[PDB]
Every structure is written in C-alpha cells, then in structure tokens.
C-alpha cells in the first residue's frame, strides 16, 4: 502493498522481500520539490516469520539500523515485546524545531492462524481487480462490515491466493492484506481513524479472521481524542476485557519521544 500520499506525509507498506528502504532518497526528493522539510520518519515492522529469507538491509535488525542511521543519524531503534516471539521493531527519527500539535492516530493489527472456512474465499485461479467478483468475497467473508458503503475502496484478489484492499474516507484510510496459506496464515490491518475506543474496530476485524493469535499496536499522540482519553485513565479498546476468548500474553507501554506514547499487546486464543 500500500501507498498513501497525503498533503503532509507518505505511508508506504510492503510485504514479502521488498527492500523498502531503497525509496528513501526519492521520498526526500519528493518533499524538496514542493519546498517541504522532513521532520518525522518512522520505520516499523512486526518480527519476520522467516527472517533468513529477507534481503538487503532487512536480513538483520542491525543492518536495518545501520541503513537508517546512514540517512538519519539521530534516529533511535526500539523493540517492543518478546524478542524470540511476537514483537515490533521500530526506528524513529524527528527534527521537530517548531513545537506543533499532534492529534493523529495509528492502529495496526497482525493476525496469524486465520479461520479455515474464511481462507476458502481468499483463493482464486484468476486475477480480479475491484469488481463484482470481489464484492462477493467481501460479503461472503465479512469485509463488507469493516469497509461499509461510506468508504471509497479498491481491492485485489490474487492468483492462486492472496487479497489486498485499500479504503479512504475523507482524510481517514484503512487497509488489509491477507496471506491465506494455512501453514503460514497471516493477515494485517491498519487505519488512522480517530476513535475514543478501538474495541468495535478491532472486534470487527477479529470476527472476519478469528485468528489463533494476534498483536495490536497503538500509537497515541498527546492531542488526539484517544490521547485525551488515555491520559485520563480512560479505556481505549485494547484492554483484555474486550477479548474474552483471548488471553493477554505480554503488553508494553513506551514514551518513545516526549509526549508521544505507543501501546502494544499480544493476544493468544485460549482454545478451550
């Protein structure tokens, strides 16, 4: 995958072995032409399921760190969660000379072991862009609920399997990518929607995939709706009470840069 270009930022999401960092020089150039100034860069990825197959600087977190340091020497890396299990790698750089107002929001989900009755619909012997055939898939699987009629959307059904969808409404976006293969089943979800509580959003995605385990990370800005709620003892939608079929295995909280926080939680299905 996904690329989101906004008035003030770029968001590039890639999977597989795409060497994502090779496009940084061109993004810096895209900001210079319009006479902008880079002030905030983040690179993030859930721990790779097969790190030995990654290429370029992505074969090791040290090399991702080395690469990003060559371009942003002040940036800082982090690792949230168990290093030999579900965790996130983050590299953050900022040159904020003008104290601004941060009211953005970012919600990401990584889901493994997807529902087998659902994977049947993420298969296809022919390529299919956004058309009547993918509409059937959205209704048959439940994506119609996550991406209702108020959203502009374009999606792609892959061959032999695979599915991607983008959705935009106003300044909000929403994306999903699915790897249906049983032995390496995975699905991702990300959105920037403003919401005092993410419980219904998350549950809507869980009902589609009902995964054996999933992680959720939440970036909280100080001046956002969720930020005001979080910084006053309010619940934000990732608390264990909202997921009774799941057990929280580890949770992290970090103020990676002043005033900005990140929450991450790993959930595993109890499997009675």
């Amino acid at each position: 995958x996904s690329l989101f270009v906004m008035k003030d930022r770029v968001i590039l999401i890639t999977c597989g072995t795409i060497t994502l960092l090779n496009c940084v020089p061109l993004i810096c150039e895209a900001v210079s032409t319009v006479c902008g100034e880079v002030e905030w860069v983040s690179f993030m990825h859930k721990n790779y399921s097969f790190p030995w197959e990654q290429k370029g600087p992505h074969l090791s977190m040290a090399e991702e760190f080395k690469t990003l340091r060559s371009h942003f020497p002040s940036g800082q890396p982090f690792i949230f969660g168990p290093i030999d299990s579900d965790h996130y790698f983050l590299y953050f750089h900022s040159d904020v000379v003008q104290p601004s107002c941060s009211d953005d929001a970012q919600l990401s989900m990584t889901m493994y072991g997807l529902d087998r009755n659902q994977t049947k619909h993420w298969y296809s012997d022919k390529m299919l862009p956004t058309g009547p055939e993918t509409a059937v898939i959205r209704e048959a699987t439940g994506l119609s609920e996550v991406v209702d009629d108020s959203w502009i959307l374009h999606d792609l059904q892959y061959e032999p399997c695979g599915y991607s969808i983008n959705a935009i409404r106003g300044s909000e976006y929403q994306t999903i990518h699915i790897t249906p293969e049983e032995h390496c089943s995975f699905a991702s979800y990300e959105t920037n929607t403003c919401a005092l509580n993410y419980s219904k959003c998350i549950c809507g995605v869980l009902r589609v995939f009902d995964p054996e385990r999933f992680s959720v990370i939440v970036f909280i800005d100080p001046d956002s709706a969720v930020g005001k709620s979080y910084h006053s003892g309010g619940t934000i939608g990732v608390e264990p009470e909202y997921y009774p079929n799941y057990e929280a295995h580890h949770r992290t909280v970090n103020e990676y840069t002043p005033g900005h926080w990140v929450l991450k939680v790993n959930y595993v299905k109890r499997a009675v």
Partner: protein
C-alpha cells in the same frame, strides 16, 4: 549476525514447518514540515508519475489508483 536478530530467528524457527510467504509487513512513514514557500497542496501537488518512480525503486508497481480531496491511495504488488 547480532544477538537480538539471533533470538528473533530462533523464535521463527520454532514456529516453522516446511509444508512460505512473508505476511508481516514493513512500514515507512515520512511527515514533512510546511514553510511559507511550501506548495499549498503539499505532496499532493505531485502527479502519479512522481509516485510511480518511487515504487520502481523497490521493484514493484501500481495496480489501481483512487484519489480524494485529502488522500491518494495506491495498491501495489511485487
């Protein structure tokens, strides 16, 4: 390799069974400042030609495009 990536690999091996595609994604985000002389449209002033060259740098390509008064959305494939 480094000790931390060594730990990460052992966790991926224990959950690995040859019977594989990388689902977990990489995310890059760049936010820019706005100076007096900045284009009033920001990065949206660029046409799709600009962003297509970006995707070529990573050996990928656009498949479909949807725009908006606020966002440009592109779906990509290897």
């Amino acid at each position: 390799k480094d000790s931390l990536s060594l730990m990460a690999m052992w966790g991926s091996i224990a959950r690995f069974d040859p019977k594989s595609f990388e689902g977990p994604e990489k995310r890059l985000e760049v936010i820019m400042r706005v100076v007096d002389g900045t284009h009033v449209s920001g990065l949206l002033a660029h046409d799709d030609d600009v962003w297509q060259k970006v995707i070529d740098a990573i050996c990928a390509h656009i498949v479909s495009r949807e725009f908006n008064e606020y966002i440009r959305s592109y779906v990509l494939s290897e």
